[PDB]
Amino acid sequence: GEELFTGVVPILVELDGDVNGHKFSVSGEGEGDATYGKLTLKFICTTGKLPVPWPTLVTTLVQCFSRYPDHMKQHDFFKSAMPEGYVQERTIFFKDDGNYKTRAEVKFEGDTLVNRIELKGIDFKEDGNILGHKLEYNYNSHNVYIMADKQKNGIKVNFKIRHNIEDGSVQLADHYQQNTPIGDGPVLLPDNHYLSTQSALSKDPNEKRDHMVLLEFVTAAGITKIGTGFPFDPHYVEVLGERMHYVDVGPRDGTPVLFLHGNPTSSYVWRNIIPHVAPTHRCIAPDLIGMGKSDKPDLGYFFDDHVRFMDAFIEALGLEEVVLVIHDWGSALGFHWAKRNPERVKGIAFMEFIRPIPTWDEWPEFARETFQAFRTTDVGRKLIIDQNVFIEGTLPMGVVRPLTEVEMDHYREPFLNPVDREPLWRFPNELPIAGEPANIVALVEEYMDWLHQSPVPKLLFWGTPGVLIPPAEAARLAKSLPNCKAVDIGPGLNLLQEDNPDLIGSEIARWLSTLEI
Ligand SMILES: [Cl-]
């Protein structure tokens, strides 16, 4: 069943409803892509005007399209029931108002995933939030809690939807849900876990009928708390006539620890790692030029531009010796600086770092087509600059766990204006993949050669399946690099700091205590 979801799947939804005697029908069409947990659908009220608010129908109107992480695939009941499908039953209690009772069958009909529903609503107030149409046309993010019902060979599901009301209040809709397979075959019965959801509601400007356009992303989580705050005072330094922002905490003496982020992040990516190190060592975490809270001049934002500014940042702070903690393009900066200043580097901690990627075969299959499209002057700028895909989509797809709205808004803040998105597009176009661009390939080969000969203490973090660093490569490097300790962080893609910050931070702290600094 799970193999039926490896690509984009067309969806059809049909709803027959009756709420307080008002009969109506809704039809929907679109597609789902479980790789991304994604649904893109358009729903039409085929009987006229919808007698209830469109948001009240979102949960009723295909959880088999949820993004289940690799390490949780044995917990995905929904896909395991396919193609024969499952019955989905709910009662939805609208607080201080009526209730919906729904029964749906979700199954494949040919190549199409179909959700057919009957809905009955009763006991609603004619002047309440639902029949009075007092709900805002928007939708919140929720946790959907799933447990097995071993006796009934299905699952029990519970969650509370928060509907924003036009007077600023919130109307709760308490969801009680049961799913049972239609077929007679066995299914996966999961351990307790949850789905983290988000939904975006919009309108079709050319559609005359009452309708709803829906974009939804859902990732499963909860099988094996992470701070969202950024409690660091801003520090600024003039670098090459531009102001760069940096975190600066911990004791003033000793060897400083320099944390370098990559694409599309900022010093925010280090927020839950720095507190493990600050007790014993100075922590300096700059925002790269063009990113975070640093100034954003009109540059090409080639790697060489970042080299120039980071060189000058390090000198501006008068750093002499450093320990480097580096990630993604921050690792290219850190390694390239170490190669040129080996006497000044007392240790390198690194993770998901820039290495020569010899063939596209080594790039994750699920992200291969998108990064190839990023690496163009037309389509790639449309995606990254015009549509902000690297922030809105590639960033969440580089983290195994769900990124919360607060965390997303921290990552979004530097790039609300499309003109400032140049570094987000130039960075993937600098990645050394399949020999191009040759100048980056040559630079990265040089610092990898240096790394293989240098005695500097090394700490390598890696996760499964990773993105830049497959687990087999991390293992090979741990065995071949001198004075290298390797730490498996568990599940992870690219931003390993977001999937296991406590292990990364505590192991850096312990490793620092073993250095002769
Ligand atoms: Cl990149």
Numbering used by the authors: 3 to 63, 67 to 229, 237 to 529
What did the original publication write about this model?
Here, we introduce a family of designed Förster resonance energy transfer (FRET) pairs with near-quantitative FRET efficiencies based on the reversible interaction of fluorescent proteins with a fluorescently labeled HaloTag. We hypothesized that engineering a reversible interaction between a FP and fluorescently labeled SLP would enable the straightforward development of FRET biosensors with large dynamic ranges. By engineering an interaction interface between a FP and the rhodamine-labeled HaloTag, we developed FRET pairs (ChemoX) with near-quantitative FRET efficiency. In conclusion, ChemoX is a chemogenetic platform of FRET pairs that enables the development of biosensors with high dynamic ranges attributed to the reversible interaction of FPs with a fluorescently labeled HaloTag.
Because of its chemogenetic nature and involvement of eGFP, this design was named ChemoG1. As eGFP and SiR show only limited spectral overlap, this high FRET ratio suggested that the two chromophores are in very close proximity. The eGFP surface residues Y39, K41 and F223 form a salt bridge with the carboxylate of the fluorophore (K41) and π-stacking interactions with the fluorophore benzyl (Y39) and xanthene (F223) moieties. Their modification led to drastic loss in FRET. We hypothesized that the ChemoG1 conformation observed in the crystal structure exists only transiently in solution and identified interface mutations to stabilize it (that is, eGFP: A206K and T225R; HT7: E143R, E147R and L271E).
